[PDB]
Design a protein around this ligand. Structure first.
Ligand SMILES: Nc1nc2c(ncn2[C@@H]2O[C@H](COP(=O)(O)OP(=O)(O)NP(=O)(O)O)[C@@H](O)[C@H]2O)c(=O)[nH]1
Ligand SMILES: [Mg+2]
Length: 168
């Protein structure tokens, strides 16, 4: 089977780990005990094609560059995650896009823009159409997620990234 290395990037606190842990462990990050953790690897069927997904969950704080650098270098595709309740995380999408292309030395690369935390309806700052505009600007797909139970579009997000990788 092919292995797809999927790298999750975005500002601190946007829910990169929450999306990853929901995808693999089917639990919300707050309820999770990382004590017994290992790497995020699964065998799964996408569009009638079995694959191994190896997910690399970056820490979002600027302090942690070695992890982000290495992870970016080895990635086959990226989720650029922001929180719809955090305007700065959305503005930082531009920087993440540029950073990925710099690390890859390519002018395009498999990516999906992920607007997380959409369950927080009364706290939402970044609109659906704002997200769609940002994605369209870079000619990348846009998807809204929630890692909080009940999860929204979590499996679809990772599966769609594989679809983009396959069809590039
Ligand atoms: N309501 C809601 N809260 C969420 C969602 N995803 C994450 N959170 C919350 O956001 C906070 C940060 O989540 P976490 O997954 O640690 O974020 P991160 O992007 O991995 N942070 P870091 O970059 O520091 O590792 C937690 O309080 C968590 O409960 C979501 O979809 N909805
Ligand atoms: Mg994290």
């Amino acid at each position: 089977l092919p292995t797809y290395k999927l790298v999750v990037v975005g500002d601190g606190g946007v829910g990169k780990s929450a999306l990853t842990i929901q995808f693999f462990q089917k639990i919300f990050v707050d309820d999770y005990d990382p004590t017994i953790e290992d790497s995020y690897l699964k065998h799964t069927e996408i569009d009638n094609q079995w694959a191994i997904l190896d997910v690399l969950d970056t820490a979002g704080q600027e302090e942690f560059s070695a992890m982000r650098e290495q992870y970016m270098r080895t990635g086959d595709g990226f989720l650029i995650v922001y929180s719809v309740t955090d305007k700065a995380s959305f503005e930082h999408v531009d920087r993440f896009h540029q950073l990925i292309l710099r690390v890859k030395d390519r002018e395009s690369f498999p990516m999906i823009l992920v607007a997380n935390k959409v369950d927080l309806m009364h706290l939402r700052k970044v609109t659906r159409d704002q997200g769609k505009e940002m994605a369209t600007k870079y000619n990348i797909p846009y998807i809204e997620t929630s890692a909080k139970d009940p999860p929204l579009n979590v499996d679809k997000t990772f599966h769609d990234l594989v679809r983009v990788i396959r069809q590039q």
